mmCIF file of all heavy atoms in Angstrom:
data_model
loop_
_atom_site.group_PDB
_atom_site.id
_atom_site.type_symbol
_atom_site.label_atom_id
_atom_site.label_comp_id
_atom_site.label_asym_id
_atom_site.label_seq_id
_atom_site.Cartn_x
_atom_site.Cartn_y
_atom_site.Cartn_z
ATOM 1 N N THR D 60 -6.973 12.846 -43.110
ATOM 2 C CA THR D 60 -5.715 13.564 -43.008
ATOM 3 C C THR D 60 -5.921 15.069 -43.189
ATOM 4 O O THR D 60 -5.371 15.870 -42.430
ATOM 5 C CB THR D 60 -4.724 13.036 -44.038
ATOM 6 O OG1 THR D 60 -4.875 13.764 -45.254
ATOM 7 C CG2 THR D 60 -4.957 11.565 -44.300
ATOM 8 P P A E 105 10.278 -4.796 -40.093
ATOM 9 O OP1 A E 105 9.167 -5.729 -40.447
ATOM 10 O OP2 A E 105 11.558 -5.363 -39.559
ATOM 11 O "O5'" A E 105 10.616 -3.917 -41.380
ATOM 12 C "C5'" A E 105 11.620 -2.881 -41.279
ATOM 13 C "C4'" A E 105 11.842 -2.281 -42.639
ATOM 14 O "O4'" A E 105 13.085 -1.530 -42.629
ATOM 15 C "C3'" A E 105 11.981 -3.300 -43.770
ATOM 16 O "O3'" A E 105 11.391 -2.785 -44.947
ATOM 17 C "C2'" A E 105 13.496 -3.445 -43.900
ATOM 18 O "O2'" A E 105 13.883 -3.900 -45.181
ATOM 19 C "C1'" A E 105 13.951 -2.013 -43.619
ATOM 20 N N9 A E 105 15.330 -1.915 -43.153
ATOM 21 C C8 A E 105 15.845 -2.131 -41.898
ATOM 22 N N7 A E 105 17.149 -1.998 -41.839
ATOM 23 C C5 A E 105 17.533 -1.726 -43.148
ATOM 24 C C6 A E 105 18.783 -1.506 -43.775
ATOM 25 N N6 A E 105 19.949 -1.504 -43.141
ATOM 26 N N1 A E 105 18.792 -1.262 -45.108
ATOM 27 C C2 A E 105 17.624 -1.238 -45.753
ATOM 28 N N3 A E 105 16.398 -1.432 -45.283
ATOM 29 C C4 A E 105 16.414 -1.670 -43.959
ATOM 30 P P U E 106 10.643 -3.763 -45.977
ATOM 31 O OP1 U E 106 9.566 -4.501 -45.259
ATOM 32 O OP2 U E 106 11.685 -4.566 -46.678
ATOM 33 O "O5'" U E 106 9.977 -2.703 -46.983
ATOM 34 C "C5'" U E 106 10.777 -1.587 -47.466
ATOM 35 C "C4'" U E 106 10.663 -1.498 -48.967
ATOM 36 O "O4'" U E 106 11.635 -0.544 -49.469
ATOM 37 C "C3'" U E 106 10.915 -2.806 -49.741
ATOM 38 O "O3'" U E 106 9.893 -3.062 -50.707
ATOM 39 C "C2'" U E 106 12.343 -2.644 -50.283
ATOM 40 O "O2'" U E 106 12.566 -3.335 -51.495
ATOM 41 C "C1'" U E 106 12.429 -1.129 -50.478
ATOM 42 N N1 U E 106 13.806 -0.602 -50.362
ATOM 43 C C2 U E 106 14.060 0.612 -50.968
ATOM 44 O O2 U E 106 13.207 1.241 -51.579
ATOM 45 N N3 U E 106 15.350 1.065 -50.834
ATOM 46 C C4 U E 106 16.391 0.442 -50.173
ATOM 47 O O4 U E 106 17.492 0.984 -50.150
ATOM 48 C C5 U E 106 16.054 -0.818 -49.579
ATOM 49 C C6 U E 106 14.795 -1.276 -49.682
ATOM 50 P P A E 107 9.715 -2.271 -52.100
ATOM 51 O OP1 A E 107 8.464 -2.831 -52.688
ATOM 52 O OP2 A E 107 10.950 -2.299 -52.941
ATOM 53 O "O5'" A E 107 9.408 -0.752 -51.696
ATOM 54 C "C5'" A E 107 9.431 0.280 -52.726
ATOM 55 C "C4'" A E 107 8.336 0.032 -53.735
ATOM 56 O "O4'" A E 107 7.038 0.132 -53.095
ATOM 57 C "C3'" A E 107 8.242 1.024 -54.894
ATOM 58 O "O3'" A E 107 9.176 0.736 -55.925
ATOM 59 C "C2'" A E 107 6.797 0.809 -55.348
ATOM 60 O "O2'" A E 107 6.655 -0.333 -56.163
ATOM 61 C "C1'" A E 107 6.082 0.618 -54.013
ATOM 62 N N9 A E 107 5.494 1.848 -53.494
ATOM 63 C C8 A E 107 6.117 2.845 -52.782
ATOM 64 N N7 A E 107 5.323 3.841 -52.473
ATOM 65 C C5 A E 107 4.099 3.478 -53.016
ATOM 66 C C6 A E 107 2.844 4.117 -53.037
ATOM 67 N N6 A E 107 2.615 5.293 -52.466
ATOM 68 N N1 A E 107 1.824 3.487 -53.669
ATOM 69 C C2 A E 107 2.068 2.303 -54.246
ATOM 70 N N3 A E 107 3.204 1.612 -54.300
ATOM 71 C C4 A E 107 4.194 2.261 -53.663
ATOM 72 P P G E 108 9.629 1.873 -56.967
ATOM 73 O OP1 G E 108 9.633 1.317 -58.351
ATOM 74 O OP2 G E 108 10.881 2.516 -56.474
ATOM 75 O "O5'" G E 108 8.461 2.961 -56.833
ATOM 76 C "C5'" G E 108 7.883 3.522 -58.037
ATOM 77 C "C4'" G E 108 6.496 4.037 -57.743
ATOM 78 O "O4'" G E 108 6.252 4.000 -56.315
ATOM 79 C "C3'" G E 108 6.216 5.490 -58.142
ATOM 80 O "O3'" G E 108 5.836 5.590 -59.509
ATOM 81 C "C2'" G E 108 5.058 5.843 -57.207
ATOM 82 O "O2'" G E 108 3.817 5.376 -57.689
ATOM 83 C "C1'" G E 108 5.448 5.094 -55.933
ATOM 84 N N9 G E 108 6.187 5.901 -54.970
ATOM 85 C C8 G E 108 7.501 5.775 -54.592
ATOM 86 N N7 G E 108 7.864 6.657 -53.691
ATOM 87 C C5 G E 108 6.714 7.403 -53.458
ATOM 88 C C6 G E 108 6.482 8.494 -52.578
ATOM 89 O O6 G E 108 7.279 9.032 -51.798
ATOM 90 N N1 G E 108 5.162 8.953 -52.657
ATOM 91 C C2 G E 108 4.190 8.421 -53.470
ATOM 92 N N2 G E 108 2.973 8.980 -53.423
ATOM 93 N N3 G E 108 4.402 7.396 -54.291
ATOM 94 C C4 G E 108 5.674 6.936 -54.228
ATOM 95 P P C E 110 3.006 15.513 -45.955
ATOM 96 O OP1 C E 110 2.193 15.729 -44.688
ATOM 97 O OP2 C E 110 3.193 16.779 -46.776
ATOM 98 O "O5'" C E 110 2.105 14.520 -46.881
ATOM 99 C "C5'" C E 110 0.782 14.956 -47.303
ATOM 100 C "C4'" C E 110 0.328 14.159 -48.506
ATOM 101 O "O4'" C E 110 1.235 14.373 -49.620
ATOM 102 C "C3'" C E 110 0.305 12.636 -48.335
ATOM 103 O "O3'" C E 110 -0.875 12.181 -47.692
ATOM 104 C "C2'" C E 110 0.374 12.170 -49.790
ATOM 105 O "O2'" C E 110 -0.873 12.278 -50.443
ATOM 106 C "C1'" C E 110 1.348 13.191 -50.386
ATOM 107 N N1 C E 110 2.756 12.726 -50.330
ATOM 108 C C2 C E 110 3.186 11.771 -51.254
ATOM 109 O O2 C E 110 2.373 11.345 -52.090
ATOM 110 N N3 C E 110 4.475 11.339 -51.199
ATOM 111 C C4 C E 110 5.323 11.837 -50.290
ATOM 112 N N4 C E 110 6.568 11.386 -50.285
ATOM 113 C C5 C E 110 4.901 12.818 -49.350
ATOM 114 C C6 C E 110 3.626 13.233 -49.410
ATOM 115 P P A E 111 -0.818 10.948 -46.660
ATOM 116 O OP1 A E 111 -2.197 10.648 -46.181
ATOM 117 O OP2 A E 111 0.230 11.277 -45.649
ATOM 118 O "O5'" A E 111 -0.328 9.710 -47.551
ATOM 119 C "C5'" A E 111 -1.255 9.157 -48.519
ATOM 120 C "C4'" A E 111 -0.523 8.329 -49.548
ATOM 121 O "O4'" A E 111 0.625 9.062 -50.037
ATOM 122 C "C3'" A E 111 0.071 7.008 -49.061
ATOM 123 O "O3'" A E 111 -0.887 5.958 -49.004
ATOM 124 C "C2'" A E 111 1.118 6.753 -50.145
ATOM 125 O "O2'" A E 111 0.560 6.236 -51.329
ATOM 126 C "C1'" A E 111 1.645 8.161 -50.404
ATOM 127 N N9 A E 111 2.869 8.467 -49.663
ATOM 128 C C8 A E 111 3.084 9.518 -48.804
ATOM 129 N N7 A E 111 4.293 9.536 -48.297
ATOM 130 C C5 A E 111 4.920 8.438 -48.867
ATOM 131 C C6 A E 111 6.223 7.918 -48.735
ATOM 132 N N6 A E 111 7.153 8.454 -47.951
ATOM 133 N N1 A E 111 6.541 6.806 -49.445
ATOM 134 C C2 A E 111 5.587 6.267 -50.226
ATOM 135 N N3 A E 111 4.331 6.669 -50.434
ATOM 136 C C4 A E 111 4.058 7.776 -49.720
ATOM 137 P P A E 112 -0.744 4.752 -47.947
ATOM 138 O OP1 A E 112 -1.872 3.796 -48.144
ATOM 139 O OP2 A E 112 -0.586 5.381 -46.603
ATOM 140 O "O5'" A E 112 0.641 4.028 -48.316
ATOM 141 C "C5'" A E 112 0.637 2.982 -49.319
ATOM 142 C "C4'" A E 112 1.980 2.291 -49.350
ATOM 143 O "O4'" A E 112 3.030 3.263 -49.600
ATOM 144 C "C3'" A E 112 2.421 1.585 -48.064
ATOM 145 O "O3'" A E 112 1.911 0.261 -47.987
ATOM 146 C "C2'" A E 112 3.943 1.574 -48.216
ATOM 147 O "O2'" A E 112 4.418 0.526 -49.033
ATOM 148 C "C1'" A E 112 4.207 2.908 -48.904
ATOM 149 N N9 A E 112 4.537 4.007 -48.009
ATOM 150 C C8 A E 112 3.715 5.066 -47.709
ATOM 151 N N7 A E 112 4.269 5.958 -46.931
ATOM 152 C C5 A E 112 5.537 5.457 -46.700
ATOM 153 C C6 A E 112 6.601 5.954 -45.943
ATOM 154 N N6 A E 112 6.525 7.096 -45.270
ATOM 155 N N1 A E 112 7.748 5.237 -45.913
ATOM 156 C C2 A E 112 7.792 4.097 -46.615
ATOM 157 N N3 A E 112 6.849 3.527 -47.367
ATOM 158 C C4 A E 112 5.726 4.263 -47.367
ATOM 159 P P C E 113 1.360 -0.331 -46.597
ATOM 160 O OP1 C E 113 0.829 -1.710 -46.797
ATOM 161 O OP2 C E 113 0.483 0.702 -45.969
ATOM 162 O "O5'" C E 113 2.683 -0.523 -45.724
ATOM 163 C "C5'" C E 113 3.659 -1.481 -46.194
ATOM 164 C "C4'" C E 113 4.964 -1.261 -45.471
ATOM 165 O "O4'" C E 113 5.513 0.035 -45.829
ATOM 166 C "C3'" C E 113 4.904 -1.216 -43.940
ATOM 167 O "O3'" C E 113 4.877 -2.508 -43.361
ATOM 168 C "C2'" C E 113 6.217 -0.496 -43.629
ATOM 169 O "O2'" C E 113 7.344 -1.330 -43.772
ATOM 170 C "C1'" C E 113 6.257 0.552 -44.745
ATOM 171 N N1 C E 113 5.678 1.856 -44.336
ATOM 172 C C2 C E 113 6.451 2.675 -43.520
ATOM 173 O O2 C E 113 7.567 2.266 -43.158
ATOM 174 N N3 C E 113 5.956 3.871 -43.121
ATOM 175 C C4 C E 113 4.750 4.263 -43.527
ATOM 176 N N4 C E 113 4.315 5.444 -43.115
ATOM 177 C C5 C E 113 3.953 3.441 -44.369
ATOM 178 C C6 C E 113 4.448 2.258 -44.747
ATOM 179 P P U E 114 4.153 -2.744 -41.946
ATOM 180 O OP1 U E 114 4.313 -4.164 -41.506
ATOM 181 O OP2 U E 114 2.767 -2.195 -42.026
ATOM 182 O "O5'" U E 114 4.991 -1.817 -40.948
ATOM 183 C "C5'" U E 114 6.343 -2.191 -40.597
ATOM 184 C "C4'" U E 114 6.920 -1.164 -39.667
ATOM 185 O "O4'" U E 114 7.007 0.120 -40.327
ATOM 186 C "C3'" U E 114 6.079 -0.861 -38.429
ATOM 187 O "O3'" U E 114 6.270 -1.834 -37.409
ATOM 188 C "C2'" U E 114 6.622 0.511 -38.023
ATOM 189 O "O2'" U E 114 7.882 0.423 -37.391
ATOM 190 C "C1'" U E 114 6.803 1.163 -39.394
ATOM 191 N N1 U E 114 5.628 1.949 -39.804
ATOM 192 C C2 U E 114 5.538 3.239 -39.327
ATOM 193 O O2 U E 114 6.387 3.733 -38.605
ATOM 194 N N3 U E 114 4.422 3.923 -39.718
ATOM 195 C C4 U E 114 3.414 3.466 -40.539
ATOM 196 O O4 U E 114 2.473 4.208 -40.817
ATOM 197 C C5 U E 114 3.584 2.123 -41.003
ATOM 198 C C6 U E 114 4.661 1.426 -40.625
ATOM 199 P P C F 16 -0.547 8.101 -61.089
ATOM 200 O OP1 C F 16 -1.212 9.159 -60.272
ATOM 201 O OP2 C F 16 0.666 8.473 -61.875
ATOM 202 O "O5'" C F 16 -0.157 6.883 -60.127
ATOM 203 C "C5'" C F 16 -0.415 6.994 -58.700
ATOM 204 C "C4'" C F 16 -1.576 6.101 -58.329
ATOM 205 O "O4'" C F 16 -1.239 4.709 -58.574
ATOM 206 C "C3'" C F 16 -2.004 6.160 -56.856
ATOM 207 O "O3'" C F 16 -3.408 5.992 -56.738
ATOM 208 C "C2'" C F 16 -1.221 5.003 -56.232
ATOM 209 O "O2'" C F 16 -1.826 4.493 -55.064
ATOM 210 C "C1'" C F 16 -1.309 3.980 -57.367
ATOM 211 N N1 C F 16 -0.222 2.965 -57.346
ATOM 212 C C2 C F 16 1.109 3.327 -57.607
ATOM 213 O O2 C F 16 1.391 4.515 -57.827
ATOM 214 N N3 C F 16 2.065 2.364 -57.597
ATOM 215 C C4 C F 16 1.753 1.087 -57.348
ATOM 216 N N4 C F 16 2.735 0.196 -57.350
ATOM 217 C C5 C F 16 0.409 0.702 -57.084
ATOM 218 C C6 C F 16 -0.533 1.659 -57.098
ATOM 219 P P A F 17 -4.390 7.267 -56.725
ATOM 220 O OP1 A F 17 -5.814 6.850 -56.560
ATOM 221 O OP2 A F 17 -4.067 8.153 -57.879
ATOM 222 O "O5'" A F 17 -3.967 8.037 -55.387
ATOM 223 C "C5'" A F 17 -4.196 7.426 -54.088
ATOM 224 C "C4'" A F 17 -3.641 8.339 -53.024
ATOM 225 O "O4'" A F 17 -2.261 8.649 -53.323
ATOM 226 C "C3'" A F 17 -4.300 9.711 -52.922
ATOM 227 O "O3'" A F 17 -5.478 9.670 -52.126
ATOM 228 C "C2'" A F 17 -3.199 10.528 -52.259
ATOM 229 O "O2'" A F 17 -3.146 10.328 -50.867
ATOM 230 C "C1'" A F 17 -1.947 9.960 -52.911
ATOM 231 N N9 A F 17 -1.464 10.723 -54.056
ATOM 232 C C8 A F 17 -1.252 10.280 -55.342
ATOM 233 N N7 A F 17 -0.770 11.200 -56.142
ATOM 234 C C5 A F 17 -0.655 12.320 -55.333
ATOM 235 C C6 A F 17 -0.208 13.630 -55.584
ATOM 236 N N6 A F 17 0.222 14.044 -56.771
ATOM 237 N N1 A F 17 -0.206 14.510 -54.552
ATOM 238 C C2 A F 17 -0.632 14.085 -53.360
ATOM 239 N N3 A F 17 -1.067 12.879 -53.004
ATOM 240 C C4 A F 17 -1.063 12.034 -54.046
#
Side-chain angles (χ1 to χ4, degrees):
Chain D
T60 89

